[PDB]
PDB file of all heavy atoms in Angstrom:
ATOM      1  N   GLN A   1     106.547-135.203 -51.988  1.00  0.00           N
ATOM      2  CA  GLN A   1     106.867-136.623 -52.071  1.00  0.00           C
ATOM      3  C   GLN A   1     107.587-136.924 -53.378  1.00  0.00           C
ATOM      4  O   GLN A   1     107.646-136.083 -54.271  1.00  0.00           O
ATOM      5  CB  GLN A   1     105.593-137.461 -52.001  1.00  0.00           C
ATOM      6  CG  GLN A   1     104.641-137.222 -53.178  1.00  0.00           C
ATOM      7  CD  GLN A   1     103.336-137.962 -53.027  1.00  0.00           C
ATOM      8  OE1 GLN A   1     103.205-139.107 -53.462  1.00  0.00           O
ATOM      9  NE2 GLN A   1     102.348-137.308 -52.417  1.00  0.00           N
ATOM     10  N   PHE A   2     108.135-138.132 -53.477  1.00  0.00           N
ATOM     11  CA  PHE A   2     108.818-138.593 -54.683  1.00  0.00           C
ATOM     12  C   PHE A   2     108.131-139.838 -55.216  1.00  0.00           C
ATOM     13  O   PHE A   2     107.671-140.680 -54.434  1.00  0.00           O
ATOM     14  CB  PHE A   2     110.287-138.901 -54.388  1.00  0.00           C
ATOM     15  CG  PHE A   2     111.083-137.692 -54.009  1.00  0.00           C
ATOM     16  CD1 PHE A   2     111.083-137.228 -52.703  1.00  0.00           C
ATOM     17  CD2 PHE A   2     111.815-137.000 -54.963  1.00  0.00           C
ATOM     18  CE1 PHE A   2     111.810-136.100 -52.354  1.00  0.00           C
ATOM     19  CE2 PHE A   2     112.547-135.872 -54.619  1.00  0.00           C
ATOM     20  CZ  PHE A   2     112.544-135.425 -53.317  1.00  0.00           C
ATOM     21  N   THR A   3     108.027-139.954 -56.540  1.00  0.00           N
ATOM     22  CA  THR A   3     107.388-141.133 -57.106  1.00  0.00           C
ATOM     23  C   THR A   3     108.283-142.342 -56.919  1.00  0.00           C
ATOM     24  O   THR A   3     109.511-142.248 -57.032  1.00  0.00           O
ATOM     25  CB  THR A   3     107.056-140.984 -58.609  1.00  0.00           C
ATOM     26  OG1 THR A   3     108.244-140.652 -59.337  1.00  0.00           O
ATOM     27  CG2 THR A   3     105.991-139.940 -58.835  1.00  0.00           C
ATOM     28  N   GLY A   4     107.664-143.487 -56.650  1.00  0.00           N
ATOM     29  CA  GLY A   4     108.414-144.716 -56.482  1.00  0.00           C
ATOM     30  C   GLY A   4     108.774-145.387 -57.794  1.00  0.00           C
ATOM     31  O   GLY A   4     108.675-144.793 -58.872  1.00  0.00           O
ATOM     32  N   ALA A   5     109.203-146.640 -57.690  1.00  0.00           N
ATOM     33  CA  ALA A   5     109.601-147.417 -58.850  1.00  0.00           C
ATOM     34  C   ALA A   5     108.475-147.525 -59.873  1.00  0.00           C
ATOM     35  O   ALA A   5     108.714-147.484 -61.076  1.00  0.00           O
ATOM     36  CB  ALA A   5     110.056-148.798 -58.417  1.00  0.00           C
ATOM     37  N   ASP A   6     107.241-147.627 -59.395  1.00  0.00           N
ATOM     38  CA  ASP A   6     106.114-147.779 -60.296  1.00  0.00           C
ATOM     39  C   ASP A   6     105.626-146.435 -60.850  1.00  0.00           C
ATOM     40  O   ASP A   6     104.701-146.389 -61.651  1.00  0.00           O
ATOM     41  CB  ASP A   6     104.978-148.546 -59.609  1.00  0.00           C
ATOM     42  CG  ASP A   6     104.395-147.807 -58.413  1.00  0.00           C
ATOM     43  OD1 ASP A   6     104.946-146.758 -58.008  1.00  0.00           O
ATOM     44  OD2 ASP A   6     103.373-148.287 -57.872  1.00  0.00           O
ATOM     45  N   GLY A   7     106.250-145.342 -60.419  1.00  0.00           N
ATOM     46  CA  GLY A   7     105.867-144.020 -60.891  1.00  0.00           C
ATOM     47  C   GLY A   7     104.597-143.469 -60.257  1.00  0.00           C
ATOM     48  O   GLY A   7     104.038-142.467 -60.715  1.00  0.00           O
ATOM     49  N   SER A   8     104.138-144.109 -59.187  1.00  0.00           N
ATOM     50  CA  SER A   8     102.872-143.714 -58.574  1.00  0.00           C
ATOM     51  C   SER A   8     103.037-142.624 -57.532  1.00  0.00           C
ATOM     52  O   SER A   8     104.125-142.444 -57.003  1.00  0.00           O
ATOM     53  CB  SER A   8     102.191-144.913 -57.911  1.00  0.00           C
ATOM     54  OG  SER A   8     102.962-145.371 -56.818  1.00  0.00           O
ATOM     55  N   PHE A   9     101.949-141.911 -57.243  1.00  0.00           N
ATOM     56  CA  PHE A   9     101.898-141.019 -56.073  1.00  0.00           C
ATOM     57  C   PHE A   9     100.560-141.171 -55.355  1.00  0.00           C
ATOM     58  O   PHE A   9      99.592-141.663 -55.947  1.00  0.00           O
ATOM     59  CB  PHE A   9     102.060-139.557 -56.484  1.00  0.00           C
ATOM     60  CG  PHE A   9     100.861-139.005 -57.212  1.00  0.00           C
ATOM     61  CD1 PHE A   9      99.886-138.280 -56.530  1.00  0.00           C
ATOM     62  CD2 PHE A   9     100.712-139.206 -58.578  1.00  0.00           C
ATOM     63  CE1 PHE A   9      98.767-137.786 -57.193  1.00  0.00           C
ATOM     64  CE2 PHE A   9      99.596-138.706 -59.260  1.00  0.00           C
ATOM     65  CZ  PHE A   9      98.628-137.987 -58.565  1.00  0.00           C
ATOM     66  N   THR A  10     100.523-140.742 -54.090  1.00  0.00           N
ATOM     67  CA  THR A  10      99.291-140.669 -53.320  1.00  0.00           C
ATOM     68  C   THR A  10      99.317-139.458 -52.408  1.00  0.00           C
ATOM     69  O   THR A  10     100.344-139.155 -51.803  1.00  0.00           O
ATOM     70  CB  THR A  10      99.092-141.891 -52.420  1.00  0.00           C
ATOM     71  OG1 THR A  10      99.519-143.069 -53.106  1.00  0.00           O
ATOM     72  CG2 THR A  10      97.636-142.023 -52.062  1.00  0.00           C
ATOM     73  N   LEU A  11      98.178-138.787 -52.299  1.00  0.00           N
ATOM     74  CA  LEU A  11      98.060-137.624 -51.419  1.00  0.00           C
ATOM     75  C   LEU A  11      96.807-137.761 -50.589  1.00  0.00           C
ATOM     76  O   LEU A  11      95.704-137.770 -51.132  1.00  0.00           O
ATOM     77  CB  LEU A  11      97.963-136.342 -52.227  1.00  0.00           C
ATOM     78  CG  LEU A  11      97.834-135.074 -51.363  1.00  0.00           C
ATOM     79  CD1 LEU A  11      99.139-134.775 -50.671  1.00  0.00           C
ATOM     80  CD2 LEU A  11      97.419-133.912 -52.224  1.00  0.00           C
ATOM     81  N   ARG A  12      96.969-137.899 -49.275  1.00  0.00           N
ATOM     82  CA  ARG A  12      95.809-137.946 -48.392  1.00  0.00           C
ATOM     83  C   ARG A  12      95.565-136.561 -47.814  1.00  0.00           C
ATOM     84  O   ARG A  12      96.444-135.999 -47.155  1.00  0.00           O
ATOM     85  CB  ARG A  12      96.012-138.939 -47.259  1.00  0.00           C
ATOM     86  CG  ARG A  12      94.763-139.072 -46.393  1.00  0.00           C
ATOM     87  CD  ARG A  12      95.051-139.813 -45.101  1.00  0.00           C
ATOM     88  NE  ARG A  12      93.926-139.737 -44.169  1.00  0.00           N
ATOM     89  CZ  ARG A  12      94.023-140.018 -42.873  1.00  0.00           C
ATOM     90  NH1 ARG A  12      95.195-140.382 -42.365  1.00  0.00           N
ATOM     91  NH2 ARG A  12      92.956-139.925 -42.083  1.00  0.00           N
ATOM     92  N   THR A  13      94.374-136.015 -48.038  1.00  0.00           N
ATOM     93  CA  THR A  13      94.131-134.619 -47.675  1.00  0.00           C
ATOM     94  C   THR A  13      92.644-134.423 -47.383  1.00  0.00           C
ATOM     95  O   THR A  13      91.948-135.393 -47.103  1.00  0.00           O
ATOM     96  CB  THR A  13      94.663-133.675 -48.808  1.00  0.00           C
ATOM     97  OG1 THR A  13      94.563-132.305 -48.409  1.00  0.00           O
ATOM     98  CG2 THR A  13      93.914-133.897 -50.140  1.00  0.00           C
ATOM     99  N   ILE A  14      92.153-133.185 -47.393  1.00  0.00           N
ATOM    100  CA  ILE A  14      90.699-132.970 -47.382  1.00  0.00           C
ATOM    101  C   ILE A  14      90.347-132.107 -48.581  1.00  0.00           C
ATOM    102  O   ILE A  14      91.227-131.499 -49.181  1.00  0.00           O
ATOM    103  CB  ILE A  14      90.145-132.348 -46.035  1.00  0.00           C
ATOM    104  CG1 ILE A  14      91.013-131.196 -45.540  1.00  0.00           C
ATOM    105  CG2 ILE A  14      90.119-133.407 -44.935  1.00  0.00           C
ATOM    106  CD1 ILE A  14      90.844-129.884 -46.295  1.00  0.00           C
ATOM    107  N   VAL A  15      89.074-132.055 -48.936  1.00  0.00           N
ATOM    108  CA  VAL A  15      88.668-131.262 -50.086  1.00  0.00           C
ATOM    109  C   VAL A  15      88.936-129.804 -49.740  1.00  0.00           C
ATOM    110  O   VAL A  15      88.441-129.320 -48.727  1.00  0.00           O
ATOM    111  CB  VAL A  15      87.176-131.484 -50.388  1.00  0.00           C
ATOM    112  CG1 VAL A  15      86.710-130.596 -51.525  1.00  0.00           C
ATOM    113  CG2 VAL A  15      86.916-132.971 -50.724  1.00  0.00           C
ATOM    114  N   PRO A  16      89.756-129.106 -50.551  1.00  0.00           N
ATOM    115  CA  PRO A  16      90.020-127.702 -50.201  1.00  0.00           C
ATOM    116  C   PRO A  16      88.761-126.843 -50.292  1.00  0.00           C
ATOM    117  O   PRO A  16      87.898-127.073 -51.142  1.00  0.00           O
ATOM    118  CB  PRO A  16      91.045-127.254 -51.241  1.00  0.00           C
ATOM    119  CG  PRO A  16      90.841-128.215 -52.431  1.00  0.00           C
ATOM    120  CD  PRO A  16      90.433-129.524 -51.791  1.00  0.00           C
ATOM    121  N   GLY A  17      88.664-125.860 -49.406  1.00  0.00           N
ATOM    122  CA  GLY A  17      87.537-124.952 -49.406  1.00  0.00           C
ATOM    123  C   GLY A  17      87.676-123.856 -50.453  1.00  0.00           C
ATOM    124  O   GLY A  17      88.778-123.566 -50.938  1.00  0.00           O
ATOM    125  N   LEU A  18      86.546-123.254 -50.813  1.00  0.00           N
ATOM    126  CA  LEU A  18      86.537-122.119 -51.728  1.00  0.00           C
ATOM    127  C   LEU A  18      86.978-120.816 -51.047  1.00  0.00           C
ATOM    128  O   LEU A  18      86.695-120.592 -49.859  1.00  0.00           O
ATOM    129  CB  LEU A  18      85.139-121.916 -52.293  1.00  0.00           C
ATOM    130  CG  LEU A  18      84.572-122.986 -53.214  1.00  0.00           C
ATOM    131  CD1 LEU A  18      83.196-122.524 -53.673  1.00  0.00           C
ATOM    132  CD2 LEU A  18      85.495-123.215 -54.393  1.00  0.00           C
ATOM    133  N   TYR A  19      87.620-119.951 -51.829  1.00  0.00           N
ATOM    134  CA  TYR A  19      88.012-118.623 -51.378  1.00  0.00           C
ATOM    135  C   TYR A  19      87.757-117.607 -52.505  1.00  0.00           C
ATOM    136  O   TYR A  19      87.387-118.014 -53.606  1.00  0.00           O
ATOM    137  CB  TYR A  19      89.460-118.633 -50.861  1.00  0.00           C
ATOM    138  CG  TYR A  19      90.547-118.975 -51.857  1.00  0.00           C
ATOM    139  CD1 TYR A  19      91.104-117.994 -52.675  1.00  0.00           C
ATOM    140  CD2 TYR A  19      91.062-120.259 -51.934  1.00  0.00           C
ATOM    141  CE1 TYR A  19      92.120-118.289 -53.562  1.00  0.00           C
ATOM    142  CE2 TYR A  19      92.087-120.572 -52.833  1.00  0.00           C
ATOM    143  CZ  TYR A  19      92.613-119.580 -53.638  1.00  0.00           C
ATOM    144  OH  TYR A  19      93.625-119.866 -54.526  1.00  0.00           O
ATOM    145  N   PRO A  20      87.889-116.284 -52.226  1.00  0.00           N
ATOM    146  CA  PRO A  20      87.392-115.348 -53.247  1.00  0.00           C
ATOM    147  C   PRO A  20      88.021-115.443 -54.648  1.00  0.00           C
ATOM    148  O   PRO A  20      89.242-115.497 -54.817  1.00  0.00           O
ATOM    149  CB  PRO A  20      87.649-113.972 -52.618  1.00  0.00           C
ATOM    150  CG  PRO A  20      87.563-114.235 -51.113  1.00  0.00           C
ATOM    151  CD  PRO A  20      88.228-115.588 -50.965  1.00  0.00           C
ATOM    152  N   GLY A  21      87.149-115.472 -55.651  1.00  0.00           N
ATOM    153  CA  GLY A  21      87.556-115.386 -57.035  1.00  0.00           C
ATOM    154  C   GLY A  21      88.010-116.677 -57.696  1.00  0.00           C
ATOM    155  O   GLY A  21      88.233-116.692 -58.898  1.00  0.00           O
ATOM    156  N   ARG A  22      88.149-117.757 -56.937  1.00  0.00           N
ATOM    157  CA  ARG A  22      88.709-118.979 -57.517  1.00  0.00           C
ATOM    158  C   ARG A  22      87.791-120.174 -57.356  1.00  0.00           C
ATOM    159  O   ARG A  22      87.127-120.342 -56.328  1.00  0.00           O
ATOM    160  CB  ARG A  22      90.078-119.313 -56.901  1.00  0.00           C
ATOM    161  CG  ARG A  22      91.137-118.233 -57.058  1.00  0.00           C
ATOM    162  CD  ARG A  22      92.337-118.679 -57.879  1.00  0.00           C
ATOM    163  NE  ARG A  22      91.975-119.598 -58.952  1.00  0.00           N
ATOM    164  CZ  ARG A  22      92.684-120.676 -59.270  1.00  0.00           C
ATOM    165  NH1 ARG A  22      93.798-120.959 -58.596  1.00  0.00           N
ATOM    166  NH2 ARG A  22      92.283-121.470 -60.259  1.00  0.00           N
ATOM    167  N   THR A  23      87.794-121.032 -58.368  1.00  0.00           N
ATOM    168  CA  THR A  23      87.163-122.332 -58.240  1.00  0.00           C
ATOM    169  C   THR A  23      88.030-123.214 -57.338  1.00  0.00           C
ATOM    170  O   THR A  23      89.124-122.815 -56.932  1.00  0.00           O
ATOM    171  CB  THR A  23      86.965-123.001 -59.601  1.00  0.00           C
ATOM    172  OG1 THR A  23      86.092-124.127 -59.452  1.00  0.00           O
ATOM    173  CG2 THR A  23      88.300-123.451 -60.172  1.00  0.00           C
ATOM    174  N   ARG A  24      87.536-124.403 -57.011  1.00  0.00           N
ATOM    175  CA  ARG A  24      88.249-125.297 -56.112  1.00  0.00           C
ATOM    176  C   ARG A  24      89.493-125.912 -56.795  1.00  0.00           C
ATOM    177  O   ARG A  24      89.418-126.361 -57.945  1.00  0.00           O
ATOM    178  CB  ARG A  24      87.293-126.394 -55.657  1.00  0.00           C
ATOM    179  CG  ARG A  24      87.677-127.002 -54.342  1.00  0.00           C
ATOM    180  CD  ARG A  24      86.695-128.071 -53.924  1.00  0.00           C
ATOM    181  NE  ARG A  24      85.312-127.620 -54.021  1.00  0.00           N
ATOM    182  CZ  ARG A  24      84.649-126.958 -53.081  1.00  0.00           C
ATOM    183  NH1 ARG A  24      85.232-126.632 -51.924  1.00  0.00           N
ATOM    184  NH2 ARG A  24      83.387-126.624 -53.309  1.00  0.00           N
ATOM    185  N   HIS A  25      90.624-125.960 -56.091  1.00  0.00           N
ATOM    186  CA  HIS A  25      91.862-126.469 -56.692  1.00  0.00           C
ATOM    187  C   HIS A  25      92.899-126.915 -55.672  1.00  0.00           C
ATOM    188  O   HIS A  25      92.904-126.467 -54.539  1.00  0.00           O
ATOM    189  CB  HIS A  25      92.507-125.390 -57.578  1.00  0.00           C
ATOM    190  CG  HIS A  25      92.877-124.145 -56.824  1.00  0.00           C
ATOM    191  ND1 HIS A  25      91.942-123.211 -56.432  1.00  0.00           N
ATOM    192  CD2 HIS A  25      94.072-123.701 -56.359  1.00  0.00           C
ATOM    193  CE1 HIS A  25      92.546-122.239 -55.765  1.00  0.00           C
ATOM    194  NE2 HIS A  25      93.837-122.511 -55.707  1.00  0.00           N
ATOM    195  N   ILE A  26      93.813-127.768 -56.118  1.00  0.00           N
ATOM    196  CA  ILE A  26      94.995-128.127 -55.350  1.00  0.00           C
ATOM    197  C   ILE A  26      96.222-127.732 -56.166  1.00  0.00           C
ATOM    198  O   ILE A  26      96.300-128.048 -57.357  1.00  0.00           O
ATOM    199  CB  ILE A  26      95.034-129.645 -55.096  1.00  0.00           C
ATOM    200  CG1 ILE A  26      93.927-130.044 -54.122  1.00  0.00           C
ATOM    201  CG2 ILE A  26      96.391-130.066 -54.549  1.00  0.00           C
ATOM    202  CD1 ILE A  26      93.796-131.570 -53.965  1.00  0.00           C
ATOM    203  N   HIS A  27      97.183-127.048 -55.547  1.00  0.00           N
ATOM    204  CA  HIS A  27      98.381-126.652 -56.276  1.00  0.00           C
ATOM    205  C   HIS A  27      99.426-127.764 -56.276  1.00  0.00           C
ATOM    206  O   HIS A  27      99.543-128.501 -55.308  1.00  0.00           O
ATOM    207  CB  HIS A  27      99.010-125.416 -55.651  1.00  0.00           C
ATOM    208  CG  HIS A  27      98.195-124.170 -55.786  1.00  0.00           C
ATOM    209  ND1 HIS A  27      98.301-123.329 -56.872  1.00  0.00           N
ATOM    210  CD2 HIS A  27      97.287-123.601 -54.953  1.00  0.00           C
ATOM    211  CE1 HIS A  27      97.479-122.304 -56.712  1.00  0.00           C
ATOM    212  NE2 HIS A  27      96.846-122.453 -55.563  1.00  0.00           N
ATOM    213  N   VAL A  28     100.201-127.864 -57.350  1.00  0.00           N
ATOM    214  CA  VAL A  28     101.278-128.846 -57.404  1.00  0.00           C
ATOM    215  C   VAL A  28     102.451-128.381 -58.273  1.00  0.00           C
ATOM    216  O   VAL A  28     102.268-127.800 -59.355  1.00  0.00           O
ATOM    217  CB  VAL A  28     100.761-130.243 -57.867  1.00  0.00           C
ATOM    218  CG1 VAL A  28     100.175-130.175 -59.294  1.00  0.00           C
ATOM    219  CG2 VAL A  28     101.879-131.307 -57.790  1.00  0.00           C
TER     220      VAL A  28
END
């Protein structure tokens, strides 16, 4: 997505699940 005039963003998603060796995260 691209930020609007106000510089805001929104992401509707679900809490990512855990996988081997890593704590919980979202990439960006």
